[PDB]
């Protein structure tokens, strides 16, 4: 509990990501498939990392699979908060749930790891409705599609982003 | 894009009209500390909170908790605004008329749904099988119903209710697994036993013959891996747990089995239509997904029915979600758009309009 | 400029918030003649006085002597005024609630600290590694703790305490160094053996294979020269001394090793969360600084855990002072200034305020 | 002279029919090196051995180790030949029929007893209190059972099992005595803590009120002398250790207390007999010997039961060995000699004779 609060920009972005409003397909393409959150310069608020986001419209035209490109956006030596809209298919349902991803690599500086870990339980309480959490502490624990599928529904998941495992 | 919600006694099925399978299937529980968790959130905390079933036996008993489940359904599970999509609700058989108006009032005043509709779960199961006349043995989580239907209308005087379903079988499997040395008592361990029941349990055609087979060899034993990596072995408990459906005395229950309940509800109908109900027995619900349950039901009802009657048990492969899939197809039809209860129509006639528009 | 004090079982770490390493690291001892000496002063007199540990096993037992250590810490070691700086204290797992209020009462009444805060040592170690869920096996001077943590909250029913740590290993090394003819019995000689242990001891992956290697050649011998001119040559004692951690029977102790203690504490948690604890085992404390201890724990726990579980032992390079460094980072944050227990709040709520603000 | 053997979960009671008290009372453990020690022999070696409970939870799980216990019972404890005396065995409630045939087979072939009999522990306790209808709260070493009995027949569908008994209370006392600075971790120190529990612990009528009383004075403190001559003082731990029976959350358990388990098992019976079970609640087992447990159970159940029902908790002074003394009186009757299962009858009907002669 480091007291780091969540900026209103992150809350607004999460609200659009969670609840889908009926909109024209042009606005549907502007929906965020994935987004990264980072500490501010003064380390007082959780803010949106500018330029680090994946749009639904980018999927299928410039982005072939949404997960591997999202992993590439993760810094190698820095901690980051992530929100991934996972579209997967189970043996008896096609599900679309948000995944809160805690990226804290071992190569990250000690100061970054301590602040992000201690403030994770505060930001996740503000983002109500998220039922999946992925804590990755190395590149191996986040780059694999089967790792995300195991967290989503375990062995019951048969597809992820429209591609079989 | 309409919404289809199947408010089951133990599991809530939700999705969009036109889809083949429900998007969200979560337990219908509300958890409060021993401040309020709904669905899988209430099961993630395990033992700190106490869980309550608002629709425990298909009939809603706590309307304050059901308003939380519907709110959790639209925003957290379906991730849509209920004010922008018409919602199709399903109701259990023998639902009191007071409850039907309550769902209409909640949908239009709290969630502000543009349109709304109520359908009977048993009728949707029968229609999904291509039938309008027959008897539906809808065995769910907390309640088992045998609903004889003639020309699309259920016969209320012949509908029988059995408080014996998958919830009681999961508790019985937990009890008989302790005879092998295992210990499943906690809420988390109850979900593991439920997964064992859904994967390894089956109905034996001849229970006494099957018991002798399991006591003379190990060909019926199966291995299951726990979430912590431990592997357990289950033997004769595979067919003993679902045997309580046909022998409720295994649970200390004084009622009859699902085969006699189906036969008794047939005998409560008109004698001229009993021949049609014998050959049109349709299984529905999750508790009817045990392999060999259709062959066992066929054998048991045959021993009860007259020898000249043709007994035919219908077990469609998609009978687990036949209520929801039937509703989704119906709600996606362009010709069904005139059957909705509009908000304008609700403002004039009030909640009582559901009786004349949805019967 | 806040103060961070880590009250360890045998070593007291203190410093200022924002610094990378503690400024003062001195033994937490009180010496009285066989009139009161604390820290290195009590060890400088050697054998004339008798030394007592007030916090011997992580839990403060003699509150009168623990006050002197705090007085020595603030005035003699940190050379700072207690009333001008908020102080962040650390507590061992399973610390009784009665002790927590006593630390708050002493800080506000004796030292008149403007602000106060208590943190769990195991949680700070886990947070410093970038984890909110995991098990921290904290091996210090007088006690070893395996503390499973889930979302930042330690599970008290699964916390296991082992009375086997570096203090016992130092005594064990002295006992086995006498088999080679060297003599170490005095208090001054004990500190020499401790320096030997911290520099030449290592954990062997295979103990029996390593023993054969040391008995067939001299490649494992590392000649250590004492402050005087004897120049001992420690051979197989390099890996025999830390082997007592995994084989406590070497010390005549019936308790299990650190690998079995970690596994037993995992098995006391929920079966759902055991998978996450296996892959998030974090080492902390000075006694975990032997080279090869992470690999040995990985091999030992794997033989205990199911083969389908992924065992991952995390040994950060800074794990010796991970408790203090984690506290220093937290106490130096501008947003953390709202979580201090102010003196105005202690005056209203009394010593019981710490239970709500520090959990 | 018949033999009466009470196979408890943690302690084995043996003796002769007609005696007032069992001759031999030894722990039911089997010790093997970390080659076979049973009873007090396995506890005399302390930590050099690993101890296993073959009947850990009232139900036999390791039949190979049980034969060692029975062999130790007859020859080393009773000092008699099994082939010269009939033996009366006691079984836990909900004992599978497969186990009952196994005990019959073992005593007739391995020990060659002339006669043999099986009795239910709960029914023997109820009979010893002069009742045929009632509910028995049998709390022993490793398991606690609530067995409702109507006209001498236990109701299997309403029997509830709680894995919380004296063994878990001894460990909890060990855990909370370390908060006072004491160290009880070894097997030898566990027997000392067990003696402290059996002599100084009591059940507080009002737990919260008693904690305030113990926090304001020293009238509730008691002194105990260790076998080595030392003296320790225990305070509020006297009533906190048995409080885990009514608040299992003290041990991290999600299960309900003994008062709620008794109430839940009553509510699982027929509505007409619940009135008789409320006024005929009989306590049995060693763990029910805490002073004040009958008054606490009376108050706790009363708050659960309707105010119009009469709650009467029966706590006979001999309830620690009510199962054995009930068996010894029954086995010593001349009219009971026709109820034995003879070897001649076993040679004809096989192990299945026990189902028709002992029910
Ligand atoms: N494959 C399966 N085999 C046996 N039982 C199942 C299977 N799948 C689900 N069930 C059982 O069905 C029950 C709920 O099914 P469902 O009919 O959807 O519930 P509801 O009562 O809400 O309609 C669960 O308790 C579960 O134990
Ligand atoms: N490099 C090292 N190798 C082995 N042991 C060490 C090393 N450094 C410190 N220790 C041991 O760690 C013990 C105390 O370390 P620490 O974790 O600070 O104790 P505490 O947590 O009780 O304050 C000392 O007794 C010392 O023997
Ligand atoms: N006077 C007493 N007060 C409290 N506990 C007791 C007393 N006597 C025995 N016990 C406890 O009862 C437990 C088991 O007794 P018993 O009923 O013989 O168990 P079992 O039925 O499993 O043989 C022991 O662990 C012991 O701690
Ligand atoms: Mg249903
Ligand atoms: Mg420490
Ligand atoms: Mg007993």
From Swiss-Prot, chain A:
PTMs per UniProt: Inactivated by phosphorylation on Ser-2. Phosphorylated on Ser-2 in resting cells. Dephosphorylated by PDXP/chronophin; this restores its activity in promoting actin filament depolymerization. The phosphorylation of Ser-23 may prevent recognition of the nuclear localization signal. Phosphorylated via a ARRB1-RAC1-LIMK1-PAK1 cascade upon active ligand stimulation of atypical chemokine receptor ACKR2.
Subcellular compartments: Nucleus matrix; Cytoplasm, Cytoskeleton; Cell projection, Ruffle membrane; Cell projection, Lamellipodium membrane
Presence of keyword Nucleus: yes
Modification sites for N6-acetyllysine: 12, 72, 143
Gene3D superfamilies in alphabetical order: Severin
Principal subcellular localization: nucleus
Subunit text: Can bind G- and F-actin in a 1:1 ratio of cofilin to actin. It is a major component of intranuclear and cytoplasmic actin rods. Interacts with the subcortical maternal complex (SCMC) via interaction with TLE6 isoform 1 and NLRP5. Interacts with C9orf72.
Protein name according to UniProt: Cofilin-1
Organism: Homo sapiens
Curated annotation (Swiss-Prot), chains B, C, D:
One GO-annotated biological process of the protein: regulation of mitotic metaphase/anaphase transition
Keyword S-adenosyl-L-methionine: no
Recorded consequence of changing residue 130 to S: In CSMH; somatic variant
Gene3D superfamilies listed in its UniProt record: 3.30.420.40, Actin, Chain A, domain 4
Keyword terms: Acetylation, ATP-binding, Cytoplasm, Cytoskeleton, Deafness, Disease variant, Dystonia, Hydrolase, Intellectual disability, Isopeptide bond, Methylation, Nucleotide-binding, Nucleus, Oxidation, Ubl conjugation
Residue location of crosslink (Microbial infection) Isoglutamyl lysine isopeptide (Glu-Lys) (interchain with K-50): 254
Substitution effect: residue 131 to C: In BNS and CSMH; also found in isolated non-syndromic Becker nevi; somatic variant
Effect in UniProt of substituting residue 54 to A: In BRWS1; likely pathogenic
Catalysed transformations (reactions): ATP + H2O = ADP + phosphate + H(+)
EC number: 3.6.4.-
Modified positions (N6-methyllysine) in chain numbering: 68
Any single Gene Ontology cellular-component annotation: RSC-type complex
Effect of residue 63 to E: Does not affect methylation by SETD3
InterPro entries: Actin (IPR004000), Actin/actin-like_CS (IPR020902), Actin_CS (IPR004001), ATPase_NBD (IPR043129)
Modified how: ISGylated. MICAL1 and MICAL2 produce the (R)-S-oxide form. The (R)-S-oxide form is reverted by MSRB1 and MSRB2, which promote actin repolymerization.
Family: Belongs to the actin family.
Misc. remarks from the entry: In vertebrates 3 main groups of actin isoforms, alpha, beta and gamma have been identified. The alpha actins are found in muscle tissues and are a major constituent of the contractile apparatus. The beta and gamma actins coexist in most cell types as components of the cytoskeleton and as mediators of internal cell motility.
PANTHER family per UniProt: ACTIN
Assembly notes: Polymerization of globular actin (G-actin) leads to a structural filament (F-actin) in the form of a two-stranded helix. Each actin can bind to 4 others. Identified in a IGF2BP1-dependent mRNP granule complex containing untranslated mRNAs. Component of the BAF complex, which includes at least actin (ACTB), ARID1A, ARID1B/BAF250, SMARCA2, SMARCA4/BRG1, ACTL6A/BAF53, ACTL6B/BAF53B, SMARCE1/BAF57 SMARCC1/BAF155, SMARCC2/BAF170, SMARCB1/SNF5/INI1, and one or more of SMARCD1/BAF60A, SMARCD2/BAF60B, or SMARCD3/BAF60C. In muscle cells, the BAF complex also contains DPF3.
Annotated disorder: Dystonia-deafness syndrome 1: An autosomal dominant form of dystonia with juvenile onset, associated with congenital or childhood-onset sensorineural deafness. Dystonia is defined by the presence of sustained involuntary muscle contraction, often leading to abnormal postures. Some DDS1 patients have dysmorphic features, skeletal anomalies, and/or mild developmental delay with impaired intellectual development. Baraitser-Winter syndrome 1: A rare developmental disorder characterized by the combination of congenital ptosis, high-arched eyebrows, hypertelorism, ocular colobomata, and a brain malformation consisting of anterior-predominant lissencephaly. Other typical features include postnatal short stature and microcephaly, intellectual disability, seizures, and hearing loss.
């Amino acid at each position: 509990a480091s007291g780091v609060a969540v900026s209103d920009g992150v809350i607004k972005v999460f609200n659009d990501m969670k609840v889908r409003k009926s909109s024209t397909p042009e606005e549907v393409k502007k929906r965020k498939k994935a987004v990264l959150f980072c500490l501010s310069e003064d380390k007082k608020n959780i803010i949106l990392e500018e330029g680090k986001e994946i749009l639904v419209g980018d999927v299928g035209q410039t982005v072939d699979d949404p997960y591997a490109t999202f992993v590439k956006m993760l810094p190698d030596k820095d901690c980051r908060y992530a929100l991934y809209d996972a579209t997967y298919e189970t043996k008896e349902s096609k599900k679309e749930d948000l995944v809160f991803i805690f990226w804290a690599p071992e190569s990250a500086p000690l100061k970054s790891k301590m602040i992000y870990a201690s403030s994770k339980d505060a930001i996740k309480k503000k983002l109500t409705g998220i039922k999946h959490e992925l804590q990755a502490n190395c590149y191996e624990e986040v780059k694999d599609r089967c790792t995300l599928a195991e967290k989503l529904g375990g062995s019951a998941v048969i597809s992820l982003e429209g591609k079989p495992l | 894009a309409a919404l289809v919600v199947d408010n089951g006694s133990g599991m809530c099925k939700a999705g969009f009209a036109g889809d083949d399978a429900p998007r969200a299937v979560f337990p219908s529980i509300v958890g409060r500390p021993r401040d309020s968790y709904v669905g899988d959130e209430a099961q993630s905390k395990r033992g700190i909170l106490t869980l309550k079933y608002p629709i425990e036996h298909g009939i809603v008993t706590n309307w304050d908790d059901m308003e939380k489940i519907w709110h959790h359904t639209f925003y957290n599970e379906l991730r849509v605004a209920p004010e922008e999509h018409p919602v199709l609700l399903t109701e259990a058989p023998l639902n009191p008329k007071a409850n039907r108006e309550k769902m209409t009032q909640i949908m239009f005043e709290t969630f502000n749904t543009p349109a709304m509709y109520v359908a009977i779960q048993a009728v949707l199961s029968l229609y999904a099988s291509g039938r309008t006349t027959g008897i539906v043995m809808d065995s769910g989580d907390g309640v088992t119903h045998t609903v004889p239907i003639y020309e699309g209308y259920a016969l209320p005087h012949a509908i029988l209710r059995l408080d014996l379903a998958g919830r009681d079988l999961t508790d019985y499997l937990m009890k008989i697994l302790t005879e092998r040395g295992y210990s499943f008592t906690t809420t988390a361990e109850r979900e593991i036993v439920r997964d064992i029941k859904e994967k390894l349990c089956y109905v034996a055609l001849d229970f006494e013959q099957e018991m002798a087979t399991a006591a003379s060899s190990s060909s019926l034993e199966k291995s299951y891996e726990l979430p912590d990596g431990q592997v357990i072995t289950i033997g004769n408990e595979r067919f003993r747990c679902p045997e309580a459906l046909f022998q409720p005395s295994f649970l200390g229950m004084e009622s009859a089995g699902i085969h006699e309940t189906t036969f008794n509800s047939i005998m409560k109908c008109d004698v001229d239509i009993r021949k049609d109900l014998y050959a049109n027995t349709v299984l529905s619900g999750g508790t009817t997904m045990y392999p060999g349950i259709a062959d066992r039901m066929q054998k048991e009802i045959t021993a009860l029915a007259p020898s000249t009657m043709k007994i035919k048990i219908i077990a469609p492969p998609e009978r687990k979600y036949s209520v929801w899939i039937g509703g989704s197809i119906l709600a996606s039809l362009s010709t069904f758009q005139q059957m909705w209860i509009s908000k304008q129509e609700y403002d004039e006639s009030g909640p009582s309009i559901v009786h004349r528009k949805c019967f």
